[PDB]
């Protein structure tokens, strides 16, 4: 049966000559889905193996002596530790970029981003830039709550205004998580009991700006819990985000399991959670609703990283398996709908992220609200269909089937009213909208609609409005791109100059002579002026011989004469 995830084994490190003993937190590092760096010791000689994930078949064994080696999340740049001596080294250029010797030993280090490596000593946290000649900069002092802890991770939000250090320690046959949440702006720290955490940018329903969320999981004093909270003051004109606290499930057999890693997918707005035993967890970032749970590994997955391409999580376990889990975009909505049986979440998910497979639900929600008498909300459902699913003529036909009530009218009127607020109305919607408006002496509303440019025009609307006010029809015809019907309007109303200017701009060529004859018929004086415009240099709109015999037909000999003499003076 279907599952909302896509689990994959990318490679087995044992198949690349990697020693099983070196497959561990202390000797193996993964800072991104791009490289895996292992520290091994061959025959009394210490070396560093870097595995390019684009070309994993052929690993490079370079002879490097370091107590720690971490690659750049993208660049072929490595950072190596030797005692208290740090060094950012260019792999491709075999040249040293930067260097620093620390007073107190660096107990943990990670790449915060491309060009930034964070350093953790027993007393403080530093940020060391790969660029320039800048020394490591102190960010904050380590909290007493984290004293004696084994530092397992360090994270920051996008804007890097919030920093987070995580450490764990063994207290009474339980691994206890200690975190320090430091705010750069407020310059203060908050100690938090948490095992795994992550930051996320999330824009709420009806919110102007993106909210910065802090999400952490723990198996602590109140058992397994997942918290989703907004950090700091919300931007001007925002809601804020209501704090979430949900349970994290640990089966009875897994009594010494706890959260080990967490990655949040901004794309689908879901939280990935990996526990010590190898269980994966899937949560909705918005509500903290659990979606999928499963054991994917028999061995602990000690290192994790975001799987950038698929917007998922990629880790490595003690067995040497390089595992990858991500959202299966084709199956997530059906699964939430039918296997999880959580329609409300499926609906929210399909509209939030533009995912597909929700159609039956939108129809159900519509038919239910239609039967409910609530036509106002029923319209909103049709309006916020993921890919214009309920924005069809059948919908309008349904709304047309309901009457005008005593003054509460009309559900079709209501449907259109909210619809234009979302975007531009389609050709058919515009047609059905104006029909009852034009029907009883009301045309001014069109002026606002057309000036605001909220509806899409084709020809069928123009001849419909032309039926009462042909001057307004010209505006419709103009936007509809139909030149034939635009020139026709200028011709009925005698505006000859605009006929020529328009046809020259849009490149449309009409039957100039036939237009001349029409002009000549109604009023010859205008005829002669029009004849003048038809012949001007390089590109003449009409044949000169053809226009003069038109003059002759009406026996306009004197004006024909005048026309030609004028034509000579304009050529001079």
């Amino acid at each position: 049966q279907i599952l909302p995830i896509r689990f994959q084994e990318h490679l087995q490190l044992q198949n690349l000559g990697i020693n099983p003993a070196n497959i561990g937190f202390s000797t193996l590092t993964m800072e991104s889905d791009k490289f895996i760096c292992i520290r091994e010791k061959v025959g009394e000689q210490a070396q560093v193996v870097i595995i390019d994930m684009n070309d994993p078949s052929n690993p490079i064994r370079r002879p490097i002596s370091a107590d720690s080696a971490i690659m750049n999340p993208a660049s072929k740049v490595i950072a190596l530790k030797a005692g208290k001596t740090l060094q950012i080294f260019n792999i491709e250029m075999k040249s040293k970029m930067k260097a620093h010797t620390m007073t107190d030993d660096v107990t943990f280090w990670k790449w915060i981003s491309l060009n930034t490596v964070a350093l953790v000593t027993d007393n403080a946290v530093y940020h060391w830039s790969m660029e320039g000649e800048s020394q490591p900069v102190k960010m904050f002092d380590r909290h007493s709550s984290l004293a004696g802890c084994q530092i397992i991770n360090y994270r920051t939000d996008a804007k890097q205004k919030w920093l987070l250090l995580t450490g764990i320690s063994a207290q009474q046959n339980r691994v206890v998580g200690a975190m320090q949440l430091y705010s750069v702006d407020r310059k203060v720290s908050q100690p938090i009991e948490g095992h795994a955490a992550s930051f996320a940018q999330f824009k709420m329903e009806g919110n102007a700006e993106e909210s910065t969320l802090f999400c952490f999981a723990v198996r602590g004093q109140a058992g397994g819990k997942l918290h989703i909270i907004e950090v700091g003051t919300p931007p001007t004109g925002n809601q804020p985000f209501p704090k979430k606290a949900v349970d994290v499930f640990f089966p009875p057999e897994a009594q010494n399991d706890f959260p080990v890693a967490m990655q949040i997918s901004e794309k689908h707005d879901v939280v990935f959670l990996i526990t010590k035993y190898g269980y994966i967890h899937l949560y909705d970032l918005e509500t903290g609703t659990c979606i999928y749970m499963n054991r994917i590994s028999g061995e602990t997955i000690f290192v994790t990283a975001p799987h950038e391409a698929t917007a998922g999580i990629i880790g490595v376990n003690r067995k040497g398996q390089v595992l990858s889990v991500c959202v299966e975009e084709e199956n997530i909505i059906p699964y939430i709908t039918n296997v999880l049986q959580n329609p409300d979440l499926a609906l929210r998910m399909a509209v939030r992220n533009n995912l597909a497979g929700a159609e039956e639900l939108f129809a159900r929600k519509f038919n239910a609200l239609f039967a409910q008498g609530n036509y106002s909300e029923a319209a909103k459902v049709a309006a916020n269909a993921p890919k214009g699913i309920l924005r069809t003529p059948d919908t309008i036909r349904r709304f047309q089937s309901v009457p005008a009530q005593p003054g509460q009218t009309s559900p079709l009127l209501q449907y259109f009213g909210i619809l234009l607020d979302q975007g531009q109305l389609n050709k058919y919607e515009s047609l059905e909208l104006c029909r009852p408006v034009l029907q009883q002496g009301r045309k001014q509303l069109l002026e606002k609609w057309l000036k605001e440019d909220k509806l899409e025009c084709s020809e069928e609307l123009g001849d419909l409005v032309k039926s009462v006010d042909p001057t307004l029809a010209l505006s419709v015809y103009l936007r509809a791109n139909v030149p034939n019907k635009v020139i026709q309007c200028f011709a009925e109303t005698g505006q000859v100059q605009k006929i020529v200017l328009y046809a020259k701009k849009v490149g449309y060529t009409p039957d100039w002579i036939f237009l001349l004859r029409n002009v000549m018929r109604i009023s010859p004086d205008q005829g002669q002026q029009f004849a003048q415009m038809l012949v001007q240099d390089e590109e003449p709109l009409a044949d000169i011989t053809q226009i003069v015999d038109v003059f002759m037909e009406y026996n306009l000999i004197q004006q024909c004469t005048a026309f030609l003499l004028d034509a000579l003076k304009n050529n001079r």
């Binding site: 010209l474 936007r479 605009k498 701009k505």
Partner: peptide, 18 residues
């Protein structure tokens, strides 16, 4: 991208507007 810009100039010259 560039089409809408030349379009607005056109409506200004011929369509009745006001």
């Amino acid at each position: 991208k560039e089409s809408a810009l030349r379009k607005q100039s056109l409506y200004l010259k011929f369509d009745p507007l006001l």
